[PDB]
Every structure is written in C-alpha cells, then in structure tokens.
Amino acid sequence: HPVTLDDLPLRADLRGKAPYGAPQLAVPVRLNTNENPHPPTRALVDDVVRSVREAAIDLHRYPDRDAVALRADLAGYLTAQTGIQLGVENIWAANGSNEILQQLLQAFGGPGRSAIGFVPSYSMHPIISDGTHTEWIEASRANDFGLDVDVAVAAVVDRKPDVVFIASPNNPSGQSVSLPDLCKLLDVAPGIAIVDEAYGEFSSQPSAVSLVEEYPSKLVVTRTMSKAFAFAGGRLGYLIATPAVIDAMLLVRLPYHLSSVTQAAARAALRHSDDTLSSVAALIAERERVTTSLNDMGFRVIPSDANFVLFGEFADAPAAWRRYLEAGILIRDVGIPGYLRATTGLAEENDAFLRASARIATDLV
Template identity: 50%
Template sequence: MTTPIVRLPVRPEHAGIEPYGAPQLDVPVLLNVNENPYPPGEDVVATIAADVASAARSLNRYPDRDFSALRADLVEYLAGESGVRLSPERLWAANGSNEVMLQILQAFGGPGRTALSFAPTYSMYPEYARDTSTRWVVGRRAEDFSLDLEHVRRTIAAERPAVILLASPNNPTGTALPTAVVEAVCEAALEVHAAGTDGAPAVVVVDEAYGEFRRAGTPSALELLDRYPHLAVSRTMSKAFALAGARVGYLAASAELVDALRVVRLPYHLSAVTQAVARAALAHAPALLAQVEALRVERDATVGWLRSQRSAAAGGAALQVADSDANFVLFGSFDDRHAVWQGLLDHGVLIRETGPDGWLRVSIGTPEEMRAFKDALVEVAGL
C-alpha cells in the first residue's frame, strides 16, 4: 500500500527550514562544538552513578518541580565562583541553557514584541525568536567584535525591544563584555518602553555559557543583578563542567523574573535523573573545573601561535585572531574558508565554519588535539 502524500499545516515561518545543528562526523579530532575535551573523572562518574541509582528508586513519582536542592547547590557554587551570593528563589534551571533562553522568549517575547542582539553572535538566538513569534532584530558589532555603545543605544531607542540578548563571552568571537558596557545596556533599556508592553523596559540577558573560561580580571554580570531587576545571567554546565551530554543550564535573576519563567515552563520539566546528575557534578566542582585553567593556557597559546602565522590562503597576510575569553578561538580571514575547513577535515580535524565571511572557529582541545590542528592548518592554509 502506498502511503498517501498529505500536506502538513506547517507554520509559514518554519517552511523549508533545516534543523539547527553543527556537523556530527566521525573523525579523530573533534574541535567544532566547544565541548570540554576532558571527560569527568572516575570518582565523579561513581558519584553520578550512585546518585542516579538513588533517584531511580523513586522514578514512579514526579520530580521536585522546583528543584529546591539543586537551587541551593547552585547558590553555593556561584558564591564561590563569582563571589555573588543569591537566594535560591533567584536561581532557575532547565535542560540546557537553550531551554532557559527559549523560556525567556516565551515569557517576555511573542507577537508584537521584539528581541534584539548584535552580530556576529550565537546563531540560535534568532531561532528562539522565530519559535516564539517574536520579531527578530540584529544590530552590528564593531570591527574588533566589541559593542559600539552609541549604536546600541540608538538601536534600542529605535526598535524598543522586549528582550536584549548579549553573549559574554560571545559565541563565535569569544569577546567578553566589560561591566561598564553591561551597565550601559541596562540603563539604555530603562530609558525605553518596550513595544507591546504596558510601559515595561526590556529584559537584558547576558549569556555566560563560557563564563568560567574568562581571563583573570574579567568580571561576571552576576555582580550587577542587585542593581538591575530586569537583568538575567544565564550559565550552562555543558562546557566548564564537561556535562554537555547531561543538558543542564541555569539562570540567575530577580525572583520576579524567575517567577515569570515558572509560568511558561512545562510541568516537571527537569527530570529527577537530570537533577541528580547536576547535583553530583556540583559536589565535585573543584575536580571538574580543574581542567579549565589548562584549557585557558592552551587557548592563549593557540591565539599567540595563530597570530604569528602568515597564510597563503589569506593572501599572504598575517592571520587575524579575535581575543577570546571562551574555550574557542575565531580566526581568519581566508579567501575561501570552506576550502580550508574541508582541507582540515580531510586531515581528520573538524572545526566550525561560522562567524563573519572568511573566518573559522576552533574549539580548544587537549594538547595532542591542538598539535594535530596546527599541523593540519600549516599544510592546508600554507602557513
């Protein structure tokens, strides 16, 4: 029997759209999705296994939908990591920071409202807007990928967004935002009534998915939360905690902002198993974060090495390399970046073809992986 062809009622904005996702290829050196190259140690694995087994004994019951114990653990972690102590009701968690961001757009975006960011930045932001029927507007960054505050202020005043999304460190550039810049954006938001609201300002979201990798002296926007109730700071356990497979993200904000997310969350959205894994990892935070400093050192060495290179694939010019506070480096500019990307892939090294035209992004791996990347790039790009 032949299956009939039926036209499905796909929303117009989704018609013909390919699902988001970086290439998943089986090659020896994977440096394309900013994963932590060091898996959790055996002691961490043992704790996770024991805690998941304990949670499994009550899987016939729904989990704690407000994940109170996890919130308390996150309070202690942030107090130690950033020196900012928050009350548990100011913490929120979900299945990766992607779900946190989607919930923000569900709560504060929607028809008649606008979300704003500044390119180049994380490519999922416009998808969150699309999926919540939120108008998407993108401004520009300066040539060094910093934010031009005059342009930011003008864009906020003209577009009157309900949500402003700022990644710090920014993906794909690695650029971190100084405290003064975040303050200026928060102040600019307060001066404008967001379109489609009853006079409220925009929610300003600082996405610190790579926050633990920031260089010494680079502050966290967590320090500004008590001054700006319309500010939210999101984090993830996927990167520094080496828990990409666990899907745990979280957010810190005012209790009122968190309450707005509780309205749109799905019932029992954070499983008992996910909560157990997250809490076990937080109990081992010092051990899991021990590799972060090694990755910082490797990142800075990679930046220095790339800047010392001249490339035939870049017209004989020295490579341009963005300053990075993350676990990746953006570099270019190549006449044909796809050819360079493909050449690296042919040598068993997978990086990411993203960012401005001509640029590529490499995640920081182990020293052995980074040697393989450099050796392949020397041959492919004519260094």
C-alpha cells in the first residue's frame, strides 16, 4: 500500500494537479524566476574567487562582527544608485531580509507593541510571531492591484500603530508608492514605518531613502542584494535609516552575524556595481519595451516598476500558462484570474517571450 498525494493533507487548492515533475523543461527560456539573468563578468567572478579564497581559511574565525566595511561599501553604492548622500552610519546588514525585519521588530515591536501592514490583493505578507500584534489590511484599488493610499492613511490615523509595513514597489503588480504618498503616511505614522524597497533598484522613480532625512525619527527603508546581485550577493538584507536607528540595531544584535567569506563575496559583488547597474538600466528599458510591445499586441499590461511585468486579461490564465510552456517560455502563474507574471530578461529572451505571446494571442477567439 505505497503512499501517494491522496494520503497527504495537501491544501485543497492543489489536489488533482499533475506535478510537472522530472526535468520536463528543455525550455530555452525561463522568465519565472525572481532575480537576474545577466551573467557575471569574468572580472567580477575573479574578484569573488580571489576574495573568498583569501578570507575562507585565514579569517574564518575573524569576521567583522559589525559588518563595517560591507556597510560602508553598500553605503557607497547607494549614494551613487540613489543620489542621496549616504554613509556607513546609515546602513545595517544581515543574513537575509527576514533577519533585518526581525531585528527591527525587536527594537520597535514585540509584546504590547502593535504593527499594521498594507497589502494589495494577492500579495504575500510576512508572518510575525513575536509578541507584536500585527494586522494586515488588504487595501488595493479594484483596478491595478496598487495600494489604495487613502484607506492606508485613514487606517494609520485610526489604528495608531507602533510599526507600519509597506512594499514599494510591491507585489503582485510591481506598483511603486509615490513619494508624496509616502509622506502622507509618514505624516500620520506615530512610530516606525518600514518601506520594503526589495525591487527598488528597478524602479524608475525616486527611492524612499530620499525621505529619510526628512522623516528620520520614523522612516526605515529595507532592501536586498538578492534581486540586483545574482552572483555573490548572498541574498543579503540591509536597511537605510538615521544613524540612531543603526545604533538601535547594534544593541539588539542577533545570535548570528555574517560569515567572513559571506561578507567578502558581497563586497566583491559591490565592487563591480557599475555593470550590475548599467545592466539593470538595460533591464528597465527592456521591461518598458515588452510593456509597450504587449499592449500594441492587444494585451492589458500592469505598468510595473520591478524586475517583472503582470499582464494579460486571459480568460483561462492557467491554460495560457500551459500554452507559454508548450511554446518554450516559462513564466509564472501567480494564481490571479486572468493574469500571468513574466520576469524581464535578456533581449533575446524577451523577444522569444513576445513572439510566443503573439502565437498565443492569435490562437484565441
């Protein structure tokens, strides 16, 4: 009596689904991922293998427990990428985005404290299990899956919370939240407000760090290397804020810190940020291309500020997904009636995606 899916307490949502198991995807094109195609320069790779090679043995027991150089390096890069003059005393680093979110919640959240988060429809919000009372309002516009800034503010003045969560740009549509609008919230926020600029590097739009100096006792901006720095970024997490906040972090320092090698890898990655910015510049342009291109083909495309685009108005989206698959393109069914999510990629890939889009569009009534 060997055991199968029917015996497992699966989520109902997933019953009857044939698992597309085996490596059943010769698919030249994968645009369902969440990071970055652009391969790494032989130059950047040599830096990594040098750097890592050097630290691995000798500095194994001697990591910079305070991630100073890395933090300065990040600060460096940020000041370039955003234009806001940043320094080591504004940056704080951790293993992942979850860790830095964890640290913040120990400084400003926890038992007795309360937070509220805003999520457009179909988003996936973090689950916070330390004593902090969190509530998640879904407040999108029945329109574009963007954040209904109006209810958001009203929700803040009413719930008067210790911490506020926003994503910008956010899932699922890749909408940014306009600076004016941030301010509107920051104005009514009584405590901390954390803005997740996970995708910030792809946004054609002033970064939220530009408002730090204006709201330094309130705003903290999260961010991550996982998106822009495929190679060597170690899926790292950092924050930008007033030097004082950084200080707050140092006093709730986690039971783990950043590997000596881990740190070096990340630094090497930053050392070649010129490319992994000019190639991000490459992406945005392409993303915009796919965008206009798709509309011209008759698709409804949700105008995005991320490494991806939400599109369609397909009657049977999951079938469309199968169709893309059967045509060599791997995009993402993200469980939204009528829409699929296609990551932006290399021009040669995007073209293929667009082509497949036409085949498919044509083959429908």
